[PDB]
C-alpha cells in the first residue's frame, strides 16, 4: 500500500523539481539528480520511521521512571 | 450489503436506561432516544390514518357529517393533542 | 423593428409571421392531443366518486371508481 | 423612449426613487374626515339598536333545536 | 530590531535562530531544575504578555521586511515564554516544539530574504508582482507567511494551539484575550505580504535574480515540512517529551 | 461606437462611489444619537421583551411557571 | 377527464410560450383559444355530473409537502361550488381569448399576450379546485404573478411598470394575512386539508397568544384569512391597486381584474364557510368591510373621466356587496351575485374596449359624445350591461343584488343595520355613474375630435360574438339560475356551503319584509338616472362652484382623487419604509455605528497605536539603555517593594492609572 | 434481464449492512467512555 | 478502534478526487490551456457523480452516522478521528460537488488569462469544504474550516474586479479568523472536561448548565459571524460583491452554510438547555436582521450589492426555523439552505453574465434588456421569482415550513419573519424591472449579446433543481427526517 | 427563416457541422449519467424512510387493539 519508502521517494522527487522550479529551471533539468533525490527521500523516510519507534520505546521507560518516582510520595 | 426488506428495530425500550439518571449508560441513552423517536412516529402515523377516516366521512356523508362523523372527529382530535413535536410537550 | 430582426426569442418577437405556420400549428395540435391521452387515463384512474349520480353520466363509461368509499372506518 | 437624459448635474442621494394640488397633512385631514363618516354611521347603528326592534321571534328547530344533527351527544 | 536590521543579512539569520536554542536551554536548566517562588514565573508571564502586544503592534507599523521579521520574532518569543511560565511538563514540551517550529520557519523566511537580497530587497512594496515574475517563489513565501500567522493545517498552528490550551488550563482569560487580539493583528500584517505579492498591480516592477541551489533545496525541504508536519508529527512530540523529562529525572 | 463596455458617466460614477464611502461622512449628530438610540437599542429590546412575554403567556396559559431565559 | 380541465390551458400556454416562434400570431392565437375552449366544454360536462347530477369528484395526484402532520398535497376537489367557479373561469376566458384574437390583431407581441392569458387561467383553475389550503395558496400567488405580467405587458410604459409593481405589493400584503391564517389553521387542527378542517371546525374552543394577547383561535384564523381576501377582492384596506390595474390591455381588465381574480377572495370565504360560520366576530368584521368598500368605490366613480376606471370602480363597489353578503351568513347569494357580475362586468369592459378601439385609443368621456347611431351593436351591448348592473327588474342583476339588500335589512344587528344603509345609499350612486357613462359616451352632443369620428368601425366577428353571448347571459342567466342557487331550501350546493340554523334568514327576508323595502333599489336607481340626466344634459353652471369655492373645489378633488387614499399611504407609509432603508438601517447603523464601532474605528485606533509604539524605537541608544534600567527598577519595585505599599494602594488603582496614561497630551 | 429488478440488487450491494453499522457505533461509545 | 466502512464508494475517495486534480495540474505547463481546462472540468464532474452515488446508497431509517470511517493520527491511537455523514449533511456535500464544476465552467472563456492557479484554487476549496461537511470531530472541523480562508483570500484578491477587493479580502479574512478563534477557545474548553473532541462521544456527555451557557456563547460567536447575524454581517456585502463571479457563487452558496450547519451539528444537540435559554435572543437578532437588511436591500444601487444583501435576510430566516426545534422548523431550515445555495448562485450567475459584457454593476446603466436579451431576461425572471419564495419554486418549501415551525413556538416571531414576504418581493421585482424592463439607453449601452451555449447549459441544472425541490420535495425530506427527528429529540426522554 | 440565431451563434458553412466546444461532451455525458443515476437509482433504492416503517407499524397496532376489545 502506502509505505515509508514510496512516500520518501515521492517527496525526494518533489523536492528536486521544487528546487528546479524555484531556480526557474525546467522541472527535469538534471534527471540523475531526481534519481539521487528519490533515493535520499526513501532512505530518510525509512530512517525516520525507525527513529520514531526507538523514541517511543525510550519515552515509555522514562515515563515508567517518572511514574515510579511520583508514586513514591504515597508511601 | 443489505438484505431485501423493510428495516427491523427492537420493539421494546432498551434495558439499561435509567430515567432518574440518563447520563449513566451511554449506549442505552442513545438507543433510548432512537426508540422514543420511532414511538412518536408511530403516533404521528396513527393520527394520520385517523385523519383519513375523518376526510372520507365528511366526503361520503355530506350535510349529515356532524351527526355521523362525531366519533371519528373526537378520536382524531384526541390523537393530535400531544403528537409529534408541535404545541404539546408530552 | 431593425435590431429586433437579429434577436432570437422563443415567443417569436414582434410581428412573427412564420412561412409554414399552418403546418406548424397542426403539428402542435397533434402533439397536445397526444399529451392529452396519458393525462386522461391517469385522471380516470385517479378520480374518486363517493356518490352514484342521480342519472348516468359520461364518466360512468371511462371511470370505475363509483361508490367505493362507503367503509371509511377502514381508510388508512 | 425618444432620448433618455444623461445627467449633467450631480445626482442626489435619494435619486433612485424619484398628489400635486393637495398637500400632505391636509390630505390626511380630509381622509380622516371620510373615515369619520364611517365611524359616525357605525355609532348611529349602535344608537339605532335595530336588535331591540326585530318583528319576529327567533327560530326554534325540532328535535332539541337539532342538537344531534349539529354534532351534540346523541 | 535595530541590530537585526543593521547587521548583514546572514548575521541576522544566524542571530534569529541559534542563540535562542542555547539560552532557552540555559533558562530551563537554571530555573526549572532550580527552586524559587512563582515570582520568576510571574516575571516571564508579564514579559510574554508585553512581548506579544508590542511585537504585534510594532510589526503592524513596519514597512521593511527585516524589521517586520524582527518584531515577529519578538512576538513569537512571547508566545514561547508562555509555555515556560505555566510550569508543567507539557509547558516545557510545547516550548521546545515552538522553538523547533519557529527555527524552521525562520530559516525558510531568511532563505527567501537572502535569495531576494541579490536584487537588494528592502521594502515590503518591493515584492509587488512577485506572483507574476516568480510564481513558485511567491507561493513558497505565502505558505511561510500563513504558517507564521498560525493558520492550520500549517506547522505554525501548534504555537497558537498551545498558547490557548495553557491559558484555558492554567485558568487565564486575560491571556486568552491578548492571544486572540494579537493573533488577529499578526494575521493582518502577515497577509499584507501575500496581498502585496498577489493582489497589487504596481506601475514599476522589480525583477529578482533566481536563487542558488543551496537556498532552493533548503527552501523546498522547509516548505514540505511546514505544509506537512502535522500529517506525521509523532517524532517531534516524542523527542520533546523525552527532553522535558530528562531535565528532572 | 465600439466595445460592449458601458460609456461611464462621471456624475453616475461619482454618485456610485459616494455610496460606497458613507462611513467616512458619519458624524455623531443629534439625529444619529436618536436613530441609533431608537433603532439600534430600543427597538431590539422591545422586540425581545415581546418575544419573551409571548413565551411567558404560553407558560401561564398551560399552568406552568415562567421560563427563565438568557 | 377532470385533469384535462385544469391542465389544458397550461399546455396551450406552454406551446405558444415556448414554440411561438414557429406558430406566430395566428398559430398561437388558434392554439391557446382552442385549448381553453375545450377546457370550457369539459367544464360544462363536469357541471353536469357534479352539480345537477349531484356526484362530487376527488382527485389526488401526489403529496406536495409532507413533514410530520403537515400534509399539503397535489389534490383536486370538485363540488357544486367548484364547478360553478369552473364555469365562470373557463367560459369567460374562452370569450376573452376569442375577443383578444381580434383586439390584439395589430399588436407586435400577441403570441406572448395569449401565453399570459392561458397561464392566468391555469393558475385560477388551480385556485378554485385545490382540496387544501396550500394548493389554494399556489393558485393565489399564480394569479397575482399572471396579473403582474399582464398589467405591465407594454413593458416600455413607465406607468404600467408602476401599476404592476403596486398590484404585486398590495396583494403580497394580503398574502401575508392569508399565509398567517394557514399557519393558524394547521396549528389548531394539525392539517391543511379542507375536508378535515371543515369536519372539525365546530369543536375547538381554546384561546391562543397572538401579538402578546389572548384571542380565540377560530376568530384569529378567520380574521387573518379575511385579510388575504381583502387584497385580492380590493376591499377597503387594500383597494387602490385595482383602479391602477387598467394599464393593461382591455381584455386583461375584463378577465382578471373584473371576472375572476378579483372574486377569489369572495370564493375563499364561501369555500371556508364551514370555518367562518364558527367565528361571529369575523362575520361582523367582514360585514363592516364589505359595506364600507361599496360606498367608497361609488363616490369615487362619479367624477372619473376614463371609461376603464369608471367600470373598475364599479367592480370594487360590487365586490363589497358580495363580501358583506358573505358577512351575514349568506354565501350562496354571494356566489350567485359573483356569477351574475361575471356576465355583465365582462360585457361592460369588453363593450367599452370596442369603443376605445374604434376611437383610436381614446378613453376620456370628455372627448367622446354621440356614437349612439355610429355604433349600434356596441351601444346596445353597453345598454344591456349597464341596465343589468344597476339592478333593472328581471335582468341578470335584479335577481341577486335586490336579495342582498333585502337580506341585510332582515339582519337585526349593529353590522346588519350598517350594511343596509351603506348598500342602499350606494345603489343611488352606481345608477348615477352608470347612466353618466351611457349619456356622455353616446347620447350627448359630440365632444369628440373630427379625425376620431372619421375612422370609426364596429367590432369584427371575434369581438362581436363574445359580446352577443355575454348579452344573452346578462338577460337570462339570473332568471335561469335563481331557483338553483338561492331557491328556498334548494339542495344544489349539497355540502359545499354551510349555514348554521341560527343564521338562516332567507325565509324571513322574502316574507317578513315591508313591500317598501323590496322597492328601495328602484326608487334610488330611478332617482340616479334622473340626477345623471339633469347634471349631464340640463346643467351648465353646476361647475362654477368648483371654480370659485375652495370647499367645493376641494370636495371635487377629494372624490376624484379617491379620498386621497393613495397619497396618504405613499406619503406616510411607503416613503417612511423607503427612507428607513437608507437613512437608518444602512447609513445610521451599517455604514454608521457598526462601522465606527467596528472595522472603520478598529482600524483607525490600531493604526494610531502602532504609530505610537513605533516611535518608541527612537533610534537613540540612550533610550534603549534607559528602558532596560527602568525595566530592572520596575521589576525590583513590584516584586519586592510591594509589602507595605498595599496599605496605601489598591491593585484596582494600579491598572487604572496605567490605562489612563494612554490618554495624555 | 429486467433493468429495475437488477437495479434493486445493485443498490442493495452498495448499502452498508444495518447490523454491522449499528454494532460498530456501540463499540465506539463504550470503548471511548471507558478510555 | 478502526471503523473502516465496507462500502466501495466511501468518503475518502470523494475527498481525494480534487486533491489528485490539483496535484496533477501543478506540473502541467500553463502553455497547455486546453488540457488544464479539461482536466479540471473532468475531475469536478467525476466528484459530482461520486457524490450522487453516495446519495444512492444512503439509509433513511437510521440515526447512526453512515459510511463512518476512521483515520489514525498517532501510533499511540489516543487521538483518532472519524468521517461520517447523516441526513443533515449529505445534501450539502452533493451541493458542494454540484457547484464546483459550475465555477470551473463560469470562467471557461477567460481561462487563458486565469491559468491552472484558478482551477487549482477552486479544487482545493472543494476538497476542504467537503472535508468540513464530513467531520465527526470538533477539532478537524476547526482546522479544515480555518484552512478554507487561504484559497478564498487568493480567489477574491487575484481575480476580483476592482481595487476594492483589497479591503474586501482583508475584512473577510479577519472577521472569519476572529470567529474561528472563538470556536477554538470553545473546543479547548470542551476538551478540558471530556479529554476528547469526538462528536459521537460529546453527544453522550452531560454538560452543566453554567458551562452549557458559556460553551454556547463561544460557539455562537463563531457561527454568527458566518451566518451572518447582525451586527457582524457587514463583511458579507464587500466580500461577496468584490469577489469574482465563481468566488461569489462559492461564498454565498456553500461558505454561508457553515455557520448554520455548525448550529445543527454541534451547538443545538450538545447544549439543549443552553439552546432553550437563548431561543428568544436568537429570535430577536434573526427578526431584526430580516426586517432591517431587507429595507437596506431596497435602497442599494449595485446589482451585486442587492443580491448579496438578500442572502443575509434568507439566512436569518434559516436560523429562526432551526431554533424552533420541531420537524417543520429544522426540516424547513435545511431545505432553505440548499435552495438558497441554488437560487443565490444562479442570481450571482445572472449578474456575472451582465458584468462580463458591460463591466458595470450600477443599476441605472441598464434597462430595456428584454428587447435585446430575451433569453437572459426569461432566466433572470425565473430566479427572481425563486428569490421571492414563490410557490412552485424550491425556496417556498423551505420558507413556509419554517414559518409553520416558528408559529407553533412563538406567534410573534412568525409574524415578524413573515414580513420577509412583503419586503422580499419589493426589492426583487424592483431589481428585475429596473434592469430588464423599460427602454434601452443607447448613450450608456448600445451593443448586446444574449446568452451563448455555455451560459445556457450552466443555468439548466439550476432551473431543474429549483423546480424539482419546489414541486416534489419528498425525495429530500425522506432522507432527512430520521436525522432531523433525532436532532429534535436529543436531550429529552419523553 | 426565424429572426436571429439560437444562442447567438452564426451557423456553420452549408454542408458542414458545428464544432463542439471542449466542455460540451464531458458536460453532456455527465448530464446523461446524472439522469440515469438519479432517475433509476432513486426509484430502485428501498423505501427505508421512517414514515413508511411507522405507517405499517401503526396499521398493525391499530389492528391488534381493535380486534382485541
UniProtKB/Swiss-Prot annotation, chain B:
Signal peptide: none annotated. GO terms for biological process: photorespiration. This is NADH dehydrogenase [ubiquinone] 1 beta subcomplex subunit 10-B. Keywords: Electron transport, Membrane, Mitochondrion, Mitochondrion inner membrane, Respiratory chain, Transport. It comes from the Eukaryota. Residues 1-24 are annotated as: Disordered. It comes from Arabidopsis thaliana. Belongs to the complex I NDUFB10 subunit family.
UniProtKB/Swiss-Prot annotation, chain D:
The chain crosses the membrane at residues 27-47. It comes from the Eukaryota. It is found in: Mitochondrion inner membrane. It is a single-pass membrane protein. Keywords: Electron transport, Membrane, Mitochondrion, Mitochondrion inner membrane, Respiratory chain, Transit peptide, Transmembrane, Transmembrane helix, Transport. Its main location: mitochondrion. The keyword Transferase does not apply. GO terms for cellular component: mitochondrial inner membrane. Belongs to the complex I NDUFB8 subunit family. Complex I is composed of at least 49 different subunits. Accessory subunit of the mitochondrial membrane respiratory chain NADH dehydrogenase (Complex I), that is believed not to be involved in catalysis. Complex I functions in the transfer of electrons from NADH to the respiratory chain. The immediate electron acceptor for the enzyme is believed to be ubiquinone. This is NADH dehydrogenase [ubiquinone] 1 beta subcomplex subunit 8, mitochondrial. The chain holds residues 37 to 125 of 125 of the full protein.
Curated annotation (Swiss-Prot), chain E:
This is NADH-ubiquinone oxidoreductase chain 2. It comes from the Eukaryota. Complex I is composed of at least 49 different subunits. Its main location: mitochondrion. It comes from Arabidopsis thaliana. Core subunit of the mitochondrial membrane respiratory chain NADH dehydrogenase (Complex I) that is believed to belong to the minimal assembly required for catalysis. Complex I functions in the transfer of electrons from NADH to the respiratory chain. The immediate electron acceptor for the enzyme is believed to be ubiquinone. GO terms for biological process: ATP synthesis coupled electron transport. The chain crosses the membrane at residues 13-33, 43-63, 69-89, 95-115, 136-156, 161-181, 217-237. GO terms for molecular function: NADH dehydrogenase (ubiquinone) activity. The chain holds residues 251 to 499 of 499 of the full protein. The gene is ND2. Keywords: Electron transport, Membrane, Mitochondrion, Mitochondrion inner membrane, NAD, Respiratory chain, Translocase, Transmembrane, Transmembrane helix, Transport, Ubiquinone. One of its GO terms (cellular component) is mitochondrial inner membrane. The keyword Nucleotide-binding does not apply. Exons a and b (AtMg00285) and c, d and e (AtMg01320) are cis-spliced, while a trans-splicing reaction is required to link exons b and c. A stretch of 270 kb of the mitochondrial genome is duplicated within the centromere of chromosome 2 resulting in the duplication of the gene. The expression of this duplicated gene (At2g07733 and At2g07689) is not demonstrated. It is also probably not RNA edited and therefore differs in all the positions known to be edited. Signal peptide: none annotated. It is found in: Mitochondrion inner membrane.
Amino acid at each position: 500500500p502506502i509505505s515509508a519508502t514510496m512516500v520518501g521517494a515521492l517527496l525526494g522527487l518533489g523536492t528536486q523539481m521544487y528546487s528546479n522550479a524555484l531556480r526557474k529551471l525546467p522541472y527535469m533539468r538534471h534527471p540523475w539528480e531526481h534519481v539521487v533525490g528519490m533515493g535520499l527521500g526513501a532512505v530518510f523516510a525509512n530512517q525516520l520511521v525507525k527513529w520514531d519507534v526507538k523514541l517511543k520505546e525510550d519515552l515509555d521507560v522514562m515515563l515508567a521512571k517518572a511514574r515510579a518516582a511520583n508514586e513514591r510520595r504515597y508511601f | 450489503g443489505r438484505k431485501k426488506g423493510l428495516p427491523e428495530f427492537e420493539e421494546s425500550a432498551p434495558d439499561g436506561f435509567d430515567p432518574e439518571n440518563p447520563y449513566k449508560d451511554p449506549v442505552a441513552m442513545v438507543e433510548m432516544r432512537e426508540h422514543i423517536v420511532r414511538e412518536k412516529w408511530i403516533q404521528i402515523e396513527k393520527a394520520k390514518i385517523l385523519r383519513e377516516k375523518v376526510k372520507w366521512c365528511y366526503r361520503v356523508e355530506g350535510v349529515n357529517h356532524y351527526q355521523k362523523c362525531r366519533h371519528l372527529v373526537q378520536q382524531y382530535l384526541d390523537s393530535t393533542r400531544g403528537v409529534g413535536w408541535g404545541k404539546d410537550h408530552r | 423593428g431593425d435590431f429586433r430582426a437579429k434577436v432570437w426569442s422563443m415567443t417569436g418577437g414582434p410581428n412573427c409571421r412564420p412561412k409554414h405556420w399552418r403546418r406548424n400549428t397542426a403539428i402542435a395540435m397533434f402533439g397536445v392531443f397526444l399529451v392529452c391521452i396519458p393525462i386522461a387515463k391517469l385522471s380516470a384512474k385517479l378520480e374518486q366518486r363517493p356518490h352514484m349520480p342521480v342519472r348516468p353520466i359520461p364518466s360512468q363509461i371511462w371511470c370505475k371508481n363509483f361508490g367505493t368509499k362507503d367503509d371509511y372506518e377502514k381508510e388508512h | 423612449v425618444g432620448k433618455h437624459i444623461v445627467p449633467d448635474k450631480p445626482l442626489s442621494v435619494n435619486d433612485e426613487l424619484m398628489a400635486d394640488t393637495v398637500g400632505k397633512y391636509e390630505a390626511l385631514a380630509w381622509l380622516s374626515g371620510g373615515l369619520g363618516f364611517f365611524v359616525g354611521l357605525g355609532l348611529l347603528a349602535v344608537l339605532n339598536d335595530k336588535a331591540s326592534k326585530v318583528p319576529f321571534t327567533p327560530r326554534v328547530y325540532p328535535y332539541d333545536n337539532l342538537r344531534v344533527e349539529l354534532g351534540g351527544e346523541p | 530590531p535595530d541590530i537585526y536590521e543593521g547587521s548583514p543579512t546572514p548575521v541576522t539569520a544566524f542571530l534569529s535562530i541559534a542563540p535562542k536554542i542555547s539560552i532557552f536551554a540555559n533558562i530551563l536548566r537554571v530555573f526549572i531544575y532550580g527552586s524559587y517562588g512563582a515570582t520568576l514565573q510571574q516575571i516571564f508571564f508579564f514579559c510574554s504578555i508585553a512581548s506579544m502586544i508590542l511585537g504585534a503592534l510594532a510589526a503592524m507599523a513596519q514597512t521593511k521586511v527585516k524589521r517586520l521579521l524582527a518584531y515577529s520574532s519578538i512576538g513569537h518569543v512571547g508566545y514561547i515564554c508562555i509555555g515556560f511560565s505555566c510550569g508543567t511538563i507539557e509547558g516545557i514540551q510545547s516550548l521546545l516544539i515552538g522553538i523547533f517550529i519557529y527555527a524552521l520557519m525562520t530559516m525558510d523566511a531568511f532563505a527567501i530574504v537572502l535569495a531576494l537580497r541579490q536584487t537588494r530587497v528592502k521594502y515590503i512594496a518591493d515584492l509587488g508582482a512577485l506572483a507574476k515574475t516568480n510564481p513558485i517563489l511567491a507561493i513558497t513565501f505565502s505558505i511561510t507567511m500563513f504558517s507564521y500567522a498560525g493558520i492550520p493545517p500549517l506547522a505554525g498552528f501548534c504555537s497558537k494551539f498551545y498558547l490557548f490550551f495553557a491559558a484555558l488550563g492554567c485558568g487565564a482569560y486575560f491571556l486568552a484575550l491578548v492571544g486572540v487580539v494579537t493573533s488577529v493583528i499578526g494575521c493582518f500584517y502577515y497577509i499584507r505580504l501575500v496581498k502585496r505579492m498577489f493582489f497589487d498591480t504596481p506601475r514599476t516592477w522589480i525583477l529578482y535574480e533566481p536563487m542558488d541551489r543551496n537556498k532552493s533545496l533548503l527552501l523546498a525541504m522547509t516548505s514540505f515540512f511546514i505544509t506537512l508536519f502535522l500529517l506525521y508529527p509523532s517524532p517531534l512530540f516524542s523527542v520533546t517529551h523525552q527532553m522535558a523529562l530528562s531535565l528532572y529525572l | 461606437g465600439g466595445g460592449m463596455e458601458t460609456n461611464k458617466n462621471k456624475f453616475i460614477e461619482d454618485w456610485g462611489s459616494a455610496r460606497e464611502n458613507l462611513e467616512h461622512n458619519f458624524r455623531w449628530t443629534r439625529r444619529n444619537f436618536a436613530l441609533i438610540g431608537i433603532f439600534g437599542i430600543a427597538l431590539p429590546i422591545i422586540v425581545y421583551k415581546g418575544i419573551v412575554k409571548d413565551f411567558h403567556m404560553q407558560d401561564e396559559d398551560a399552568g406552568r411557571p415562567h421560563r427563565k431565559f438568557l | 377527464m377532470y385533469l384535462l380541465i385544469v391542465f389544458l390551458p397550461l399546455l396551450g400556454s406552454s406551446v405558444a410560450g415556448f414554440f411561438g416562434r414557429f406558430l406566430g400570431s395566428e398559430g398561437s392565437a388558434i392554439m391557446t383559444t382552442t385549448c381553453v375552449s375545450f377546457s370550457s366544454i369539459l367544464s360544462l360536462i363536469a357541471f353536469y355530473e357534479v352539480a345537477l347530477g349531484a356526484s362530487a369528484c376527488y382527485l389526488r395526484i401526489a403529496p406536495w409537502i409532507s413533514s410530520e402532520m403537515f400534509d399539503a398535497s397535489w389534490g383536486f376537489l370538485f363540488d357544486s361550488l367548484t364547478v360553478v367557479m369552473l364555469i365562470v373561469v373557463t367560459f369567460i376566458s374562452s370569450l376573452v381569448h376569442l375577443y383578444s384574437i381580434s383586439y390584439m390583431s395589430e399588436d407586435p407581441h400577441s403570441p406572448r399576450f395569449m401565453c399570459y392569458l392561458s397561464i392566468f387561467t391555469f393558475f385560477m383553475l388551480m385556485l378554485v379546485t385545490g382540496d387544501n389550503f396550500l394548493q389554494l395558496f399556489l393558485g393565489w400567488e399564480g394569479v397575482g404573478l399572471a396579473s403582474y405580467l399582464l398589467i405591465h405587458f407594454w413593458f416600455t410604459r413607465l406607468q404600467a411598470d408602476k401599476a404592476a409593481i403596486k398590484a404585486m405589493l398590495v396583494n403580497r400584503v394580503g398574502d401575508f394575512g392569508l399565509a398567517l391564517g394557514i399557519l393558524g389553521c394547521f396549528t389548531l387542527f394539525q392539517t391543511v386539508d379542507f375536508s378535515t378542517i371543515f369536519a372539525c371546525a365546530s369543536v375547538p374552543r381554546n384561546s391562543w397568544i397572538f401579538c402578546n394577547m389572548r384571542l380565540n383561535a377560530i376568530s384569529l384564523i378567520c380574521i387573518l384569512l379575511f385579510i388575504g381576501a381583502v387584497g385580492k377582492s380590493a376591499q377597503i384596506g387594500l383597494h387602490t391597486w385595482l383602479p391602477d390595474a387598467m394599464e393593461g390591455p382591455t381584455p386583461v381588465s375584463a378577465l382578471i381584474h373584473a371576472a375572476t381574480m378579483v372574486t377569489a377572495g369572495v370564493f375563499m370565504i364561501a369555500r371556508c364557510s364551514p370555518l367562518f360560520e364558527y367565528s361571529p366576530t369575523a362575520l361582523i368584521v367582514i360585514t363592516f368591510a364589505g359595506a364600507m368598500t361599496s360606498f367608497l368605490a361609488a363616490t369615487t366613480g362619479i367624477l372619473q373621466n376614463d371609461l376603464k376606471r369608471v367600470i373598475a370602480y364599479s367592480t370594487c363597489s360590487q365586490l363589497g356587496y358580495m363580501i358583506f353578503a358573505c358577512g351575514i351568513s349568506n354565501y350562496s347569494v354571494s356566489v350567485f351575485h359573483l356569477m351574475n357580475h361575471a356576465f355583465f362586468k365582462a360585457l361592460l369592459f369588453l363593450s367599452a374596449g370596442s369603443v376605445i378601439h374604434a376611437m383610436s385609443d381614446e378613453q376620456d368621456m370628455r372627448k367622446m359624445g354621440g356614437l349612439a347611431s355610429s355604433f349600434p351593436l356596441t351601444y346596445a351591448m353597453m345598454l344591456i350591461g349597464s341596465l343589468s348592473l344597476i339592478g333593472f327588474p328581471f335582468l341578470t342583476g335584479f335577481y341577486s343584488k335586490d336579495v342582498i339588500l333585502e337580506l341585510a335589512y332582515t339582519k337585526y344587528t349593529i353590522s346588519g343595520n350598517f350594511a343596509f344603509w351603506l348598500g342602499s345609499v350606494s345603489v343611488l350612486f352606481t345608477s348615477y355613474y352608470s347612466f353618466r357613462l351611457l349619456f356622455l359616451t353616446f347620447l350627448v352632443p359630440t365632444n369628440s375630435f373630427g379625425r376620431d369620428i372619421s375612422r370609426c368601425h364596429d367590432a369584427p366577428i371575434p369581438m362581436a360574438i363574445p359580446l352577443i353571448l355575454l348579452a344573452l347571459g346578462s338577460l337570462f342567466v339570473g332568471y335561469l339560475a335563481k331557483d338553483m342557487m338561492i331557491g328556498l331550501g334548494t339542495n344544489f350546493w349539497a355540502n359545499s356551503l354551510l349555514v348554521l340554523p341560527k343564521n338562516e334568514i332567507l325565509a324571513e327576508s322574502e316574507f317578513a319584509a315591508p313591500t317598501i323595502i323590496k322597492l328601495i333599489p328602484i326608487l334610488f336607481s330611478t332617482l340616479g338616472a334622473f340626477v345623471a340626466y339633469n347634471v349631464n344634459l340640463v346643467a351648465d353652471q353646476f361647475q362654477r362652484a368648483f371654480q370659485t369655492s375652495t370647499f367645493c373645489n376641494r370636495l371635487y378633488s377629494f372624490f376624484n382623487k379617491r379620498w386621497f387614499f393613495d397619497q396618504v399611504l405613499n406619503d406616510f407609509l411607503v416613503r417612511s419604509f423607503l427612507r428607513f432603508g437608507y437613512e437608518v438601517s444602512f447609513e445610521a447603523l451599517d455604514k454608521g455605528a457598526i462601522e465606527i464601532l467596528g472595522p472603520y474605528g478598529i482600524s483607525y485606533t490600531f493604526r494610531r497605536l502602532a504609530e505610537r509604539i513605533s516611535q518608541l524605537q527612537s533610534g537613540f541608544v540612550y533610550h534603549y539603555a534607559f528602558a532596560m534600567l527602568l525595566g530592572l527598577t520596575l521589576f525590583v519595585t513590584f516584586f519586592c517593594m510591594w509589602d507595605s505599599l498595599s496599605s496605601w494602594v489598591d491593585n484596582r488603582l494600579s491598572f487604572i492609572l496605567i490605562v489612563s496614561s494612554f490618554y495624555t497630551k | 434481464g429486467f433493468i429495475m429488478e437488477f437495479a434493486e440488487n445493485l443498490v442493495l450491494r452498495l448499502m452498508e449492512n444495518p447490523e454491522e453499522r449499528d454494532r460498530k457505533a456501540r463499540e465506539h461509545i463504550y470503548e471511548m467512555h471507558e478510555r | 478502534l478502526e471503523h473502516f466502512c465496507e462500502c466501495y464508494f466511501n468518503l475518502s475517495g470523494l475527498i481525494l478526487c480534487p486533491v489528485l486534480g490539483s496535484i496533477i495540474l501543478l506540473f502541467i505547463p500553463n502553455s497547455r490551456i486546453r488540457l488544464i481546462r479539461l482536466i479540471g472540468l473532468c475531475a469536478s464532474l467525476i466528484t459530482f457523480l461520486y457524490s450522487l452515488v453516495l446519495w444512492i446508497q444512503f439509509d433513511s431509517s437510521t440515526a447512526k452516522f453512515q459510511f463512518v470511517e476512521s483515520l489514525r493520527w498517532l501510533p499511540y491511537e489516543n487521538i483518532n478521528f472519524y468521517l461520517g455523514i447523516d441526513g443533515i449533511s449529505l445534501f450539502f456535500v452533493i451541493l458542494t460537488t454540484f457547484l464546483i464544476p459550475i465555477c470551473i465552467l463560469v470562467g471557461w472563456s477567460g481561462m487563458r488569462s486565469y491559468g491552472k492557479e484558478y482551477i487549482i484554487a477552486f479544487l482545493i476549496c472543494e476538497f476542504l469544504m467537503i472535508a468540513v461537511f464530513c467531520m465527526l470531530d470538533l477539532l478537524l472541523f476547526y482546522v479544515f474550516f480555518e484552512s478554507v480562508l487561504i484559497p478564498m483570500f487568493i480567489i477574491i484578491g487575484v481575480w476580483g474586479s476592482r481595487q476594492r477587493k483589497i479591503k474586501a479580502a482583508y475584512q473577510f479574512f479577519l472577521y472569519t479568523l476572529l470567529g474561528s478563534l472563538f470556536m477554538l477557545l470553545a473546543i479547548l474548553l470542551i476538551l478540558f472536561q471530556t479529554g476528547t473532541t469526538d462528536l459521537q462521544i460529546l453527544l453522550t456527555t452531560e454538560f452543566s448548565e453554567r458551562r452549557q451557557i458559556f460553551l454556547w456563547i463561544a460557539f455562537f460567536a463563531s457561527f454568527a459571524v458566518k451566518v451572518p447575524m447582525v451586527p457582524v454581517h457587514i463583511w458579507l456585502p464587500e466580500a461577496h460583491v468584490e469577489a469574482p463571479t465563481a468566488g461569489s457563487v462559492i461564498l454565498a452558496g456553500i461558505l454561508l452554510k457553515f455557520g448554520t450547519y455548525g448550529f445543527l451539528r454541534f451547538s443545538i444537540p450538545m447544549f439543549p438547555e443552553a439552546t432553550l435559554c437563548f431561543t428568544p435572543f436568537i429570535y430577536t437578532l434573526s427578526a431584526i436582521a430580516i426586517i432591517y437588511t431587507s429595507l437596506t436591500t431596497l435602497r442599494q444601487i449595485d446589482l451585486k450589492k442587492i443580491i448579496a444583501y438578500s442572502s443575509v435576510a434568507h439566512m436569518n430566516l434559516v436560523t429562526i426555523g432551526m431554533f424552533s426545534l420541531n420537524i417543520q422548523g429544522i426540516g424547513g431550515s435545511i431545505l432553505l439552505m440548499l435552495s438558497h445555495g441554488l437560487v443565490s448562485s444562479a442570481l450571482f450567475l445572472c449578474v456575472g453574465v451582465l458584468y462580463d459584457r458591460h463591466k458595470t454593476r450600477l443599476v441605472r446603466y441598464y434597462g430595456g434588456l428584454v428587447s435585446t436579451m430575451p433569453n437572459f431576461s426569461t432566466i433572470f425572471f425565473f430566479f427572481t421569482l425563486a428569490n421571492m419564495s414563490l410557490p412552485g419554486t424550491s425556496s417556498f418549501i423551505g420558507e413556509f415550513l419554517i414559518l409553520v415551525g416558528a408559529f407553533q413556538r412563538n406567534s410573534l416571531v412568525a409574524t415578524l419573519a413573515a414580513l420577509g414576504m412583503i419586503l422580499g418581493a419589493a426589492y426583487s421585482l424592483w431589481l428585475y424591472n429596473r434592469v430588464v424592463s423599460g427602454n434601452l439607453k443607447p448613450d450608456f449601452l448600445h451593443k448586446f449579446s444574449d446568452l451563448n451555449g455555455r451560459e445556457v447549459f450552466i443555468f439548466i441544472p439550476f432551473l431543474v433543481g429549483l423546480v424539482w425541490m419546489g414541486v416534489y420535495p419528498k425525495v429530500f425530506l425522506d432522507c432527512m427526517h430520521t436525522s432531523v427527528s433525532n436532532l429534535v429529540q436529543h436531550g429529552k426522554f419523553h | 427563416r426565424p429572426k436571429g440565431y439560437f444562442m447567438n451563434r452564426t451557423p456553420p458553412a452549408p454542408g458542414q457541422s458545428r464544432k463542439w466546444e471542449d466542455w460540451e461532451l464531458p458536460c453532456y455525458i455527465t448530464s446523461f449519467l446524472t439522469i440515469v443515476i438519479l432517475g433509476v437509482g432513486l426509484n430502485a433504492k428501498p423505501d427505508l424512510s421512517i414514515e413508511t416503517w411507522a405507517h405499517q407499524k401503526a396499521l398493525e397496532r391499530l389492528e391488534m387493539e381493535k380486534l382485541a376489545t
